[model samples]
Target: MTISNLLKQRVRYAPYLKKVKEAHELIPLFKNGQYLGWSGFTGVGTPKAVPEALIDHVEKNNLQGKLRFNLFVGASAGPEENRWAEHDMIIKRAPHQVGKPIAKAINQGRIEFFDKHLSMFPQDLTYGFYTRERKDNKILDYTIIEATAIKEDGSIVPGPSVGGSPEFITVSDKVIIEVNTATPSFEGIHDIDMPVNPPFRKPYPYLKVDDKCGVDSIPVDPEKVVAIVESTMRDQVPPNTPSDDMSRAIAGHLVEFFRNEVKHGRLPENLLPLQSGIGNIANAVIEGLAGAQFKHLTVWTEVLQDSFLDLFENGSLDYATATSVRLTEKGFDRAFANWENFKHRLCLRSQVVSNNPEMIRRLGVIAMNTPVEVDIYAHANSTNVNGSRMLNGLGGSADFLRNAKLSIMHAPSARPTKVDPTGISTIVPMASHVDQTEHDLDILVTDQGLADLRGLSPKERAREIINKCAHPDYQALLTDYLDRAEHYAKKHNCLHEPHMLKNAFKFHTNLAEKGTMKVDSWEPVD
Candidate 1:
């Protein structure tokens, strides 16, 4: 369909801005057999108030037994120990989430879970997979999203908060959006350009790269939007900090590396637009950055936290952009009082805008994300364990890494091993499956060492990657795997070990000693 024709389809705007009462009213529509999608990406793009309202509706309205929701990709909430768990709501869960709290529920078998690949969700929606069980006219029932801003022209601006929300918001039959005006207003976020893959290999036409420069906006049929709620209050969720010395050391190394890059001419003088994943390591990295001497920083990020507060308060960060305000009460109070200090420097946008491909490329983002496991070839496993369970939803890592000028993926030196008696340092073999392929990686860093992959041959890449990224204790084991893999390749008349290194996850785990296996990096990202 032509972009013009798509836009001409009348879109009715629902402009109600009630914080929680509106959410309270619209949430009870779920019937026993309805499939729903929630709009959140990890912790950033989450619609904080509405989820609580839905839980309240279910628990109070006796609507629990009648509703079953098919969560699209990531499960964003659950720090408070299954406060979201209820008899009325059946969470048909997906694999690949980063929340241990949610995993705790799943481990107890509290929810009916279905595992899927990171790429499959978008593919399924584009191919009309939701129409299979019902008639083509009958689609997945609803989607609820929290957005940063909605311009007069109908364009939605996202802060640093574009996770899996793009797909869920695009595909659902009925859409309810919570326009969060309390967050800051972001301007730099404009496009989300992801490479379209198979089943829907055509370019993702809905996403525009530079909407500010007049790229056509994503089409949302006004008929699909059933309600709009304005919510300003967010759940005050603080970032969890790393506890051990190893994690702190890893964070120190990353900060130093970033600082060094700035000292050199590689990154911007104030540090290139930085992006990091959500977790202790990412948090620690932020903490480490706090101790650095840099100032006048501009952060294009997803979530704001203590480190952000430190920058703002210390007059280090000049400006910042984000999707949501998911900070602790203390952080929020500090920010709230210094509203004048941040009003201009800070802005928020929707997930689509924050993680857009075109904008990331044009803006020269430096992408840093955490990975559960990364293969020898640099394919990163950000989601899923054993390639089956859901971690958090595939947030915006794929979006940022694919377009960033400097893309760095971080992992720990070892994973816990159950195979051998003496636990050894080795990342699990075949990190479930690759969330970000080697083609998207420029540098891979582990607590053990760092590997710069740019401008290097496959042999050189393998040598440095293993030498640096692999844990010191697991180096010999990784080298052996590389050699064995090469041997197999030669026997099959395939590429040599260097050439074989192109298969990213070929050596996911290797034994450091006899019998035992351990993830080479436990403190991977921070």
Candidate 2:
């Protein structure tokens, strides 16, 4: 009656048979109350059919409420709408699920939310591998990973992605894989490599990657692959957009930045490998890109869009590779009508392939993403704003930033100001928390000015950032802060300016109320 015993007895229930027979052999290891870790971020490479079948089996056989294992990940996909698992309702709680229906549930107090750091999932796991926790929080018992291909040599080809798959596979107890052939075959597309910090800046002065087994493949046991399912369902479309000015400004700034990147050397001359985030910023950017001269460009990303369709049809874009297409019904129909053209040009893979570090680096992706807030020091919050509020999941931004040759985070310079004339944008300090650090940032642009952070020292970066990126109303305050920061850096022999580390929320808030701010243009205003 137990999950382990059930797996042992029902070998035929396995999703894919050829490679998974060996995996089913370990079904007896699953414990009843153990935490289940589902692989897939956002809506891509989610183990669609098999996990649903298994959960349905559990639900049908009266296994609804015996879970003590709280689901410990972000959005897998929309629940109730999908058949696999209504994770929104089935799991004890979700940290950040941004769909409107899920948001409604959270607002109604139907879910118990946890305040978590975006990078802490891997950070805590990395920490756990070294240190024991005060109390034993549940580690993953089973990981149901939906991937693209499984080679005869047992090396899984991550299609569509690799968001947290490395962490999931390395840390899970048992691995259940579902290989979906519905995804495209994109071999030799990835070239994943993390930059090794120099001896002076390395986290551990003596730490080194193992020569024998480099950290390239997911560390799942070959024998633990349980079931493999072939699924062919569409990823659900995201909710409608917010019509507020914040959304509009976000759209405008991203548009301007993309144009500027083309003008600069950060992007290819024709803007090849155009990548953007998953939300309004990305949507807005794509809308912006449709208008630019970024013709014959190629797209290497996780999701495709109507804007992409426009480019494809107009001969501006040559091809695209992504995991899914989230669009309105009309939009989907329009794209589906041209499946032949798309099949030739658009290839959908698992998240492992789409966001793979190797692929991104090799293809030279120009990653454009949105942030919830950005600290003066250039730390970004892509998930939470105040460190406590739940936004969307930290989807593919991390993957893009790590591997892409050009990493750009785009958002409006200001949140709406309550006061006029002063017109101070509510650019928060510290961004709730940092998802991407300044080290990875290439350029920070607003409609205000493009802050090129790549070749500058902290002091120089600070000046460019204040003059160009900060709102005009906040210029004086930012300059004053920079002056203080520069003096403090000199006095203390610190690596970075002090004012950059000061309370950003306080500075921006004060600037929002006062009007002494001016322009930081190299060109004369008059």
Candidate 3:
């Protein structure tokens, strides 16, 4: 009864029909501290009914904290893992995650969470770096993957993102591929390239964006495929944060900078292959391209947000490729409906090829990303809040920035709190945590203005950042801190990347003590 006519049509591999199993059958396999991975990235293409079934079993049996799992995925999944974290079903997590419950679990000591680059995580897991203590570091207990269809040869088609799925399948002892009948079969969209270990690793074959160096679907051994799951339901991708005035302003400035770059004979007319990070600001920047003086843009980024659809619709974007197409809930409805129009120009790729630094440098990609804060010296704080608490793992920001010809980080100059409008200025004397160094980043942009840090030393960069990127209210404060830190550090004869270590985090300290980041004086009165 579970395997309907719709499912039968999707599974051209006739033998797999006999292997179909009910969703509840999966509950038993997951009871003991199971080591498992899922097919997911930013929600879409994640397993639907399997996680739902396990969740149901946990609730019905009143086994809240009784069952736990060591979970892995390409990147952040839908709300299933978050729900699992809510019920205390996850004991350990890795690479990346989204949702507040999982966030709380990771931060509050309920889960052992480790964060790493999205591009590197999959291959590293396969290498046994994550499972050092285990007898077989190369194996996962189970891996449940979502498939849009089962091909004639038994290779399965994936939906939104192929992110780390090939690696998961490589390591999984028992694989459960959920052949989804409800959604459209996304065959021929993927460029699935499996991993090759060190020393023998060869150069990536393709040079351009649309080049296909890999196969269409993930090839699975029929024997290892324990069961084909009959599934229905979708990945829960929420709506994107609508662009604000500040985000729009930031977009305008970036647009102008690109125009100038094009005029200078440095960048070509259409600009280099674009790579925008995930967020409202990223969306705004992509949306900004609609009215740009340029045309026929191509993108090579990690995730495709709702704004890319706007770029496509406006005819500005000729081709776009990424590891995932993570549109909003309603956004997918529009995308799926407009599939015919978009499919030819779009291709989904594995994170290995998508986030590889070698390709980014070769392609001369123009990278854009957001950060929590940026210090005067152009170092960025991407993951941590105050250098202690983590927001998410580094993801693939560094991978792109490290090698991209033009690496640009854009964010708000100041973030407002409930008490004050200028609660915490991102442009600080020093970043509390530096994930992307000045060496990696060429430019930093805030709503106030863009700071070009190329070829400029620390002191030179400091004054320029304060003059351009720092908010007017915080400009004086940042300038004062740099001047004083310079004066004190020069006295000590170590002024290269000068910092009065004691006063470096004064803004953060003030934000903690008072509701706002504003401080009256640098030196304290006894």
Candidate 4:
């Protein structure tokens, strides 16, 4: 009945019992200025007791800024882990995060945050890129992982998501396992692949979506695990955002585009393994696929959402694999009730493997994600507002966009500010920031229409994007700007992409000064 007895009962490794201690007792081991690696991805399978106990200690001792640590994880964690950010407990963070307090700290320049492509982050950490200049000569001091069960051989079976546990365990000097008893043991749902260093690296030979390419559980040495504790809690996964008219319209355009691809022999009838980013637009795209004529489609993505349930129920999707299953309450209930049927149809892998560029390109995935703004040259900004403040970190948009066989960026044509009908243009003359460059983009879609940029030059891309994706209110203005830039470039005999470097950002400047992107008239001023 006690915590220690419960842990002893659950832990298969018997010799590790002497190291068991209460979560609070382990706080002293984590001194300030140490790097802490945790097992979590998109609000699932994160250590609960240790993090909560650490928070309690920090608050009780009033060590808010004094006890800061650099945190590392595969992606955004639950409130239990991210709440520490509110207390200034995190000095630096990486890869991805999502929470109001953390976002505030990032935007306010209080925390040193770095956004990375999910697939590259784990390997980068292993290569000592993140902690290359550490004077302590330590890669990671400790790594806390949540496991449903520990095998007799000392290998740990992770719950729901493998995330970065494999790599974290490999690089950490010490390990702590929190065996969660509240949830069922997810022993068979994971396929974990560890990476090898360069000069001996080989390709990931994945020909289909359902292929299992790695071990079933994370292989850990018993010598590394310092403690084992028992925890009882469920993951704090949020509900899905419902789709609106604009999202649905974007979805319709994508479905039609895929159909055209199939007719032209560019894509299969079932389509390739799909990779979708998070949010309402991606959700609507999946919902559209559910009703369309496509059947037996597959998904290879970072996070799976509620629409995956509909795809499963309609028998449109045959197999789905991701790092996290971020379903809503209703969606979880539905999937649990039919676990026998759906369990065999899905598998969770580490983020490193799920978002691997090699695997994405080999399987020819269809990558679709939402962007804040896209320019006529097809460059997209997935993060940042007005090129200054931080939005949610770039997550995994770049991982798929740069490697997938067909890459797509979708958004609404225009957004509203306070005082104008068409206050801001999603299709701008130039993006404020460039997360996905023009070379990586294949198509751009908006509620207005879709622009196919495949095999097109910059001039052709600009023309199509202006005619098809731009809002009607801003079309003429964009055209005028492009026309002037074009004439100026031709006269100067420097027409490579055609831009007046001085006046390239005038639209953004006007928006900042006048509260709208619309300009009355334009003339070249020397």
Best by TM-score: 3
Going through the candidates in the order shown, the clash numbers are: 52, 23, 0, 0
lDDT of 2: 0.55
Give per-residue CA lDDT, model 2, range 150-219, as digits (tens). 5445555554444456666666666777555444442333222222223433322211111112233343
For residues 1-526, what per-residue lDDT tens digits would candidate 1 score against the true structure? 1212212222223232222246677765766666666655445556655666767777776665465565554335433214554342556665345456566556567666554433344545546664477655645677776665555455444433554555665667777776665665433443433324356644333222112323323344555667666666655465567536555667777787887787788887777677754566776776677777777776666656666777777887776655444566676577668766656566544444465565578778888887867766676876665565555656667878888998987767776556643253434323447888877889887777778888776556777878887776567756765665566666777653343333333333334243455334322111
Model 2: lowest-lDDT 10 consecutive positions: 204-213
Q: Stretches of candidate 1 above 4 Å error?
A: 1-28, 37-41, 44-66, 72-75, 78-88, 91-234, 242-244, 259-264, 416-432, 487-492, 497-515, 518-526
Evaluate all candidate structures by whole-model CA lDDT and list the values in order.
0.59, 0.55, 0.85, 0.85
TM-score for candidate 4, residues paired by index: 0.96
Question: Model 4, range 1-526, lDDT digits (tens) per residue?
Answer: 3555556556676676666777888887899988999998887888999999999999999999899889998888889756788888988898788787888888888789999988888889999999987987779999999988877777888987778888899889999988987766777778888768889888776677777865777888888888777788788776677899999999999999999999999998889999875788998898898878789999999888778878888889999999987776676578778878877899888888888888888889999988899988888998888897777788888989999999998999999888786889998778889999998999899999999999998989999999999999999988988888889888988776887667667677888889898977664644
Model 4 residue 3 CA deviation in Å? 4.0
lDDT of 1: 0.59
> Candidate 3 — which pairs collide?
none
Stronger candidate by lDDT (2 vs 3): 3
Name the regions of candidate 3 deviating beyond 4 angstroms.
136-138, 333-338, 524-526
For every model shown, what is its TM-score relative to the native structure?
Answer: 0.70, 0.62, 0.97, 0.96
Better of 1 and 3 by lDDT: 3
- The regions of model 4 sitting more than 4 angstroms off are 4-10
